[PDB]
């Protein structure tokens, strides 16, 4: 489905392509776009961030606050990829 589709750009395109260090900046920005509590994604890993996000925001606007937060980091060249593949689902349901 789109939703799962989606979910594999944020993980696995997304989220698995940062450092661990890189992560922890990620989760610090997480509450400017998710109504999720800072504390709950403290010790959290990518599987268990991406499922979350998902869970408050839905897929689609996941992937697209999670690009807005790369690009808010000057992470430039992943928040491209992750538009780039979600461009190229968006094309199989369109």
């Given at each position: 489905a789109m939703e799962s589709k989606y979910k594999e750009i944020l993980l696995?395109?997304?989220?698995?392509?940062?450092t661990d260090e890189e992560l922890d900046r990620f989760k610090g920005f997480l509450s400017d776009e998710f109504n999720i509590a800072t504390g709950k994604l403290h010790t959290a890993n990518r599987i268990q961030v991406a499922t979350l996000m998902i869970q408050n925001a839905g897929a689609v606007s996941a992937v697209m606050k999670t690009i807005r937060i790369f690009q808010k980091l000057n992470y430039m060249l992943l928040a491209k990829r992750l538009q780039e593949e979600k461009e190229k689902v968006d094309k199989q349901y369109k």
């Open positions: 696995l395109t997304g989220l698995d392509n940062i």
